Paper text:
Further analysis of the different hexamers forming the mature CA lattice in polyhedral CLPs revealed that despite the deformability of the CA hexamer, local symmetries exist in the lattice. Aside from the C2-symmetric hexamers that are also observed in regular tubes (and are surrounded by only hexamers, Fig. 3b group V), a fraction of hexamers in the polyhedrons were surrounded by either two or three pentamers in a symmetrical manner and hence followed C2 symmetry and C3 symmetry, respectively. As the structure of the tube-like hexamer with C2 symmetry was already solved at high resolution from regular tubes, it was not further characterized. In contrast, the structures of the other two-symmetric hexamers highlight the structurally dominant influence of the pentamer, where it actively defines the conformation of its adjacent hexamers. Specifically, the two CA monomers facing a pentamer adopt an arrangement similar to those two CA monomers in the pentamer, causing an increased spatial separation between the CANTD’s of the hexamer. This observation was further confirmed via the structure determination of a small set of T = 3 icosahedral particles solved by single-particle cryo-EM. In T = 3 icosahedrons each hexamer is surrounded by three pentamers, which causes the described threefold-symmetric distortion of the CA hexamer. The similarity of the C3 hexamer from the T = 3 icosahedra (formed by CA) to the C3 hexamer from the polyhedrons (formed by CASPNC and [name]) suggests that the structural deviation from C6 symmetry is not due to the presence of either the [name] molecule, nor the absence of the β-hairpin, nor the SPNC region.
As the virus buds from the cell, the viral protease cleaves [name] into several fragments, including the capsid protein (CA) that then assembles into the mature capsid shell (core), rendering the virus particle infectious. The CA portion of all retroviral [name] proteins folds into two separate domains, the N-terminal domain (CANTD) and C-terminal domain (CACTD). In mature lattices, CANTD interactions form only intra-hexamer and intra-pentamer interfaces, while CACTD interactions are also involved in formation of inter-hexamer and inter-pentamer interfaces. Our results show that, like lentiviruses, [name] is sensitive to [name] in vitro and in cells, where in the mature CA lattice [name] binds in a pore formed in the center of the CANTD hexamer.
Numbering used by the authors:
A (entry chain B), B (entry chain C), C (entry chain B): 11 to 148, 152 to 229
D (entry chain A): 154 to 229
The structure:
């Protein structure tokens, strides 16, 4: 076992402190420090250092839930890269959370007994839990294009709020289109209305508006 | 698979944040981080981090279109470095966008199944898409030299607007010359007109005007 | 051929005059007078009498478009109840609009040559055209529950505006739910938020809110 | 590069003047059409500018631009 550099961890902690949990740069940095498969000890200490107390509690909860979903999928398929072929290799949550025998508090023994599939599953679970907590900590039908705001900023904000919401995946594109049409102050509303072609995708609407927009 | 440094990615993101998408320094930095052939995962996460939401949507669109042009050229020539000789090596867009089987979300498997020709084609496509989106997101025949403006500022502005426009590459120098001659308020107009030598290059015109300009 | 009673037509015209084109009572009355299969003469004169000049022009347009869709489906299936088995029974738009030979201006000859399948197709086409024009003549993301408005009125208005809009059919229920949650002033918002059960249907949300609403 | 469509001038006169001055100039033959197009787009006072901008089709020839503008021009 080799620990992560405290210099990288300090830089990541200051990034989370200034930019927040949800910025794309912060998620990119987390993906960077989430490159090699980490042991439960590593991810646990990392989240202890970079996250405050309350986000850390939320993250522990979310990580447990995601690991439980993983273990349900594992008992639903004996071919999990964390599992084995016989029943003696079935992976318990004590082994995933680092609570099993020979692992509690010892990262060396942890790295000894853990499987690479176990490590990558733990890592993906922790990443998804971080995403959930970031989306939770700090409304798409209330988004309007400001009188002075450009259109690409409005589109970015709207697509962000629509994709990071409780809608089904198959209902995001129609909602984004119909919000482009009814929000996006009446100059762009009329620009989209008088489209000789039929625009059936947010990307096509964005391209059309960027082409024919009133330069100002 | 080895990930790109989050330090380089953070520096590139701040470069894009301060200089913009279209500055030559930004394009040089992107070319730098676009040196080794990247996997679809790498380029996708890179554009997710450095670009905002709306430019990222535009870039996904443009990348898809360019990859489709590449696949049309590939079905138009069985000797593509991404293709093979038999029909069983034909490359589908699911394999280019990283959507094929054994690749979705897994960069290791991605790096396993992908060809180097596939990687370089994906990389060139992503670079061209970035160029398109940068030209799209944020007029040379309307540029006049102000009454109080110096000549080097006017020349900088004019050359910038002419080279960053929709003209062919072989039509920029004559246009820059003829705009130096007709814009550039009548003192410099007469200074260029009464040139005992024939000036046939923007650099030569700039040198001549800087030599014989009215110091004031 | 037997004409429709001018008394019923006068009552229907006054209904359209007072209630409008889109009221459910008006559509019910139209469905009532659209019970027996009508000849093109009957429907044409009926719409001439009950509709004003501009709605009548719109309705002629829409009726033509719907009849053209019907004739496309008819040439796409030789088993149309208006068609026959051989090619000599194929139904042209002149026969549907009453413009064919032996039919122009004569309702008796019309009733003679027309098929019952022709009549029912014409009738359904005219009904759909009336619906289109009614929806067109006199915004769901702008609907709020007023401070004094009851919840069933708000739900009626919202479901009406969402179903009579440009959304796909598979995107109406999620939009109605998410509009119940974000509109519907904060008392009902908190009432829906603190639902011990998960409500996954507009009807279930309406039932829950009607049960636990603050009687006032 | 100094040709503008006057406030009262028609569009065919402006197009005639511009094509005359561009073809009777020192540009290479392969650079006249793009210059004429980009001068139609940036000159030709903002009503026609917006008329050309909001073209559902892509106009890639001075003749096509002239035809489109003559079709959809504001009769006055």
């Amino acid at each position: 076992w080799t620990p992560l550099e405290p210099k990288l961890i300090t830089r990541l902690a200051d990034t989370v402190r200034t930019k927040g949990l949800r910025s794309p740069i912060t998620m990119a940095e987390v993906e960077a420090l989430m490159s090699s498969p980490l042991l439960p000890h590593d991810v646990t200490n990392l989240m202890r250092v970079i996250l405050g107390p309350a986000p850390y509690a939320l993250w522990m909860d979310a990580w447990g839930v995601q690991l439980q979903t993983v273990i349900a999928a594992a008992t639903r398929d004996p071919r999990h890269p964390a599992n084995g072929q016989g029943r003696g290799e079935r992976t318990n949550l004590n082994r995933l959370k680092g609570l099993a025998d020979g692992m509690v508090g010892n990262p060396q023994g942890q790295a000894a007994l853990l499987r690479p599939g176990e490590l990558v599953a733990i890592t993906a679970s922790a990443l998804q839990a971080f995403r959930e907590v970031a989306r939770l900590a700090e409304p798409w039908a209330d988004i309007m294009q400001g009188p002075s705001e450009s259109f690409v900023d409005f589109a970015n904000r709207l697509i962000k709020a629509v994709e990071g919401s409780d809608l089904p995946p198959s209902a995001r594109a129609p909602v984004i289109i119909d919000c482009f049409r009814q929000k996006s102050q009446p100059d762009i509303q009329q620009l989209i209305r008088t489209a000789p072609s039929t625009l059936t995708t947010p990307g096509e609407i964005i391209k059309y508006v960027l082409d024919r927009q009133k330069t100002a």
